[PDB]
Amino acid sequence: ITTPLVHVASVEKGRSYEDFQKVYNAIALKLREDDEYDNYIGYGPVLVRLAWHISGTWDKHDNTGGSYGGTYRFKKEFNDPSNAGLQNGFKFLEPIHKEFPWISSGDLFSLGGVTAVQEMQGPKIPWRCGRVDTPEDTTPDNGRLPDADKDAGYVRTFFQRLNMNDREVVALMGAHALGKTHLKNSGYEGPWGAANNVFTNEFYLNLLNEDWKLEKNDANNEQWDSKSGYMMLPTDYSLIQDPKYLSIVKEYANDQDKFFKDFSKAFEKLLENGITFPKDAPSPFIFKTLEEQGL
Amino acid sequence: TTPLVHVASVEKGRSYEDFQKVYNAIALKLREDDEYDNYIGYGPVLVRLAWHISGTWDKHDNTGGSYGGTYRFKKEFNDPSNAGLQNGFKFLEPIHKEFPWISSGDLFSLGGVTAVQEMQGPKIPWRCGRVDTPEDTTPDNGRLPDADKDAGYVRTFFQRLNMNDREVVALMGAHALGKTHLKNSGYEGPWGAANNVFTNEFYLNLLNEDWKLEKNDANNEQWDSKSGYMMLPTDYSLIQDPKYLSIVKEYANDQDKFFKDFSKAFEKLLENGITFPKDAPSPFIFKTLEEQGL
Amino acid sequence: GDVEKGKKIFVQKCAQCHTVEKGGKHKTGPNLHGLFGRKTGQAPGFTYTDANKNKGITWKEETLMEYLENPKKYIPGTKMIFAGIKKKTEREDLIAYLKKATNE
Ligand code: HEC
Ligand code: ZNH
Ligand code: ZNH
Structure with a gap:
């Protein structure tokens, strides 16, 4: 057989809501600036697909895949045939990770999707932190999409x-x-x-x-x-x-x-699948849009 | 109260060849009636008309914009922010009657593309297909x-x-x-x-x-x-x-x-709110009067 | 024909490059005094092109009623970046003014 995996959401060292609103905002501000991607559609849609593809690799039987490990950063599931076109959504997020080195890959890729939906006038998707980056061999095989x-x-x-x-x-x-x-x-x-x-x-x-x-x-x-x-x-x-x-x-x-x-x-369930949230874990963060901030 | 889509529809049977002619008619008239506003010509008022018809757009509910050509109606036409544009309208009117098939939106916007191009400016890619929409879709004054x-x-x-x-x-x-x-x-x-x-x-x-x-x-x-x-x-x-x-x-x-x-x-400004299909032509790069030897 | 409506034409389409009086400094173009009844590339003090002083023609009312449509057609390889006035009424009125202002 093979024993299921357990992933505990560990909040980034010393970070809170205000620190994540800054990440949302940096993604949101860049969605505005790079407004010409794919003949003016912008980077918004490719990010929702990114959030979904890094999460849809999940298998409820052994708790493999999911958004937790942030394994999209690895060769194996990067160059996955089903993930062709997402490299554009990745290099969009790459300079946002330089400004926020502290945030985990799973948290960034998932926040990219939550932000994109909100900025494109969609509903508020409650989001939680805690996804921790896992090693190169925790990466799921191609074919789960x-x-x-x-x-x-x-x-x-x-x-x-x-x-x-x-x-x-x-x-x-x-x-x-x-x-x-x-x-x-x-x-x-x-x-x-x-x-x-x-x-x-x-x-x-x-x-x-x-x-x-x-x-x-x-x-x-x-x-x-x-x-x-x-x-x-x-x-x-x-x-x-x-x-x-x-x-x-x-x-x-x-x-x-x-x-x-x-x-x-x-959408929240999809991004949160396979993650065990400790009793002391912060409540789901509901982020304010650039429009709701007057920014 | 919301959800509108505006699909571009090329004015029945019209090609690129038809559209270069209506551009030329606007260009040849800019050359003809160049006495206006102390020899500045109608060029600048036409660039401004193209923007004021398009600048009434709202991304929230997709209302306003160039598509409907609602400037032909009294509410938008008498807009205190639109004062001075009547001169550009009256200029485009004889051209609209030489080419009755062209939609008001397409003419107002093309007039702006023609103006900037004939003024030794950059080439502006333009797309047809704006359809004239009824009187009740005219945006309220104050969007400018x-x-x-x-x-x-x-x-x-x-x-x-x-x-x-x-x-x-x-x-x-x-x-x-x-x-x-x-x-x-x-x-x-x-x-x-x-x-x-x-x-x-x-x-x-x-x-x-x-x-x-x-x-x-x-x-x-x-x-x-x-x-x-x-x-x-x-x-x-x-x-x-x-x-x-x-x-x-x-x-x-x-x-x-x-x-x-x-x-x-500018192309973006004039195309805001308009959805272009697949069975739609590529943006037109019109030749200036100078390039056709006219 | 109007020298008055011809003044507006000069101010609008030419004055940003030309002076018309004697003792008028050369800007991005030579001073236009001593025009009617003079050769091309004439005005003492400007660095002309090897195309314009060499067109070698007298400057009169009707020949420049033609150069005024296309400054590049009647004179190749010039630095006069002007597309020309195409109409006859307007060319007539600018030429009328010019004979006054460019001499006395
Ligand atoms: C008004 C509409 C006019 C008129 C009547 C003229 N110009 Fe001007 N001009 C400019 C330059 C750089 C030159 C020199 C050309 C060269 O040497 O290559 C000129 C020249 C002329 C001439 C001929 C000069 C000569 O042979 O002596 C005439 C008759 C003349 N111009 C008349 C530049 C400009 C402009 C842009 C910077 C503009 C605008 C005009 N000119 C306009 C007009
Ligand atoms: N305007 Zn202006 N305008 C703006 C944009 C984005 C563009 C087009 C791409 C504009 C173009 C013109 C233009 C050319 C003008 C001259 C028209 C003429 O000669 O008749 C023009 N716009 C003029 C005005 C203007 C004058 C009104 C008059 O007396 O005829 C204004 C008070 C005016 C205002 C603004 C404005 C505020 C803008 C944006 C922040 C703006 C954009 N325009
Ligand atoms: C059944 C199932 C499914 C499938 C098969 C799919 C599929 C798919 C495909 C094929 C594509 C394409 C790609 C390209 O670009 O080319 C896509 C896209 C896509 N997608 Zn989706 N999906 C899905 C689901 C989904 C979901 C669930 C979501 C979310 C959440 C999505 C979102 C998406 C998006 C948004 C897109 C677009 C992107 C861009 O724009 O780029 N998606 N997708």
Whole structure:
């Protein structure tokens, strides 16, 4: 067999809320300055994917992977085929780590995602510190991240390894309102919606209201394209072919506010999976936006 | 109360070839009716029209902007901040009737691209597809900036348009064109000597003249030079701020960098709020009258 | 034809580089006094280009009513960075003023 891993959240030496608001702010201030990445979408979307990919490596059976170890900094899971394009989100965070050497890799990569969602007018995602950097061989094998060419059954089974129910996966998938797919990264070209740098419920509205036709692209992979120039991955489209998933997609499309409460909790859970928080651990930090600071 | 998307739709069956013609018609008329405002021409008022139609945008709810061409309606047209632009509108009107198919938004914005290009300025990549939207989508008066404020306000204002410090200072260089008229804005005088030639003169003047705060007949304060130039309190803000000043100095030294940065920012300013599909054409780089031998 | 509306043209499109009176200093261009009835590259004191003193023509009303459309076409490789006035009415009015102001 093999004994499960236990990861205890150890807060950085002498740091508190005020010190982390400074990190949020440095990431937030740089999201404004480097406003031209990927034809004006900005670095916001690539950071949400980064937060999710470093966390989605998790296996609830032996507590391997997850955001804790900050193992994205290593060769093995860097150059992981499923992580192609995230190197841009990494070198965005690299000078923010120079200004704050004290913060752990897991805490930075996860804060990058929480910040990006907030600055792109999304809900407040409560965030906690404590992720400690682990050695080079605590790095998970390539292959733990999901396939885009599958169905509702794969999508269910995959997310069960991450301890997510039908409602939490449909909620998490709504982050696809942000950014785009790039051909040289994953074999799919195009955006899921119009407003791809402002967190909305556009994903569900587009998935329900548009006309979609399955067709192979230039990389010879099949995707669902609309006459409007939008796109859906087979896994994204199979949030509607499945009757249970369709009912949750319908309710999030009808009420953006429910999607916002449910996204927050699920997004926090994703970044917090596999981490045991001691009794004395600080409460989840809710950060103020640059707009809420007058900065 | 919110959630709007504005998809660009090329005016039915129109190509690049059609759009170069409407550019040429605006350029040939800038050459024809160049008697206006004591031989400055309509060039500067057209750059300013392009900005005032676009500068009403709000990133929070995606309202306002260039798309709707809502300047054709009384609320936006009679806007006290839009005083003086009627001259630029009336100039573009005979051109709108020679090319009825072009949308108001596309014409107003193209008029700004034509102006800057024919003024020996940088090439501005322009995209078609702005659709005229109905009367009820006209933004309320007061979305445009005030001229009597500081660097704090100028920084805060432009965030509503997603403009960073480098983009706002680049956009403010358009003030090398035209002049302020007391009867319109409540300010009087040019910013430079060649106010019909697109250069980096704005920043050079700002850094090198002896500016003195004086009050005009409209009772507003403005910075005046004894060389016959002036600077708005918001234009002076760019040297009263260390971040803004670093960029003013950078542009005053290199014009080709300012030119490069202005194109990028001006195109952004005119394209804000507009979603361009895949079945959409690449930005057009229009040839000047000089390059077509006209 | 207006010398009065011709004054506005000169102030707007030329004065930032030219003086018209005798004893007027050379800025980014020579003093325009002694223009009508004189050769190209004439004004004593400026460092002209090997293209303009060499065009070698007399400066009269109508020949410069043509140079005024394109300063680069009628004279190649010059440092006169002016795209020219294309209209005839405006060229007519600048030339009218010039014959006054550039002599007495
Ligand atoms: C108004 C619209 C005018 C008029 C009527 C003229 N200019 Fe000027 N000019 C400038 C330079 C650098 C030169 C020298 C050219 C060279 O030697 O290469 C000139 C020259 C002239 C001449 C000819 C000089 C000669 O042969 O003696 C004439 C008739 C003349 N200019 C008339 C520069 C400029 C400008 C930019 C810096 C501008 C603007 C003008 N000139 C405008 C005008
Ligand atoms: N303006 Zn100004 N303006 C601003 C930007 C970002 C750009 C464009 C890219 C502007 C361009 C012009 C322009 C050219 C002008 C001359 C027009 C003319 O000759 O008729 C012009 N803008 C003029 C004014 C002006 C004069 C009004 C009048 O009397 O006709 C103002 C009071 C004015 C103010 C501001 C202002 C405040 C800005 C931003 C902080 C600004 C940007 N403009
Ligand atoms: C089923 C499942 C899944 C899948 C398969 C996927 C897939 C994928 C793909 C293919 C892509 C592409 C890449 C490129 O760029 O090219 C992406 C993107 C993506 N993604 Zn997602 N995802 C997912 C989930 C998800 C989630 C859950 C999230 C969150 C939280 C996300 C977020 C994302 C983003 C945001 C993006 C974009 C990025 C950019 O822009 O760059 N995502 N993604």
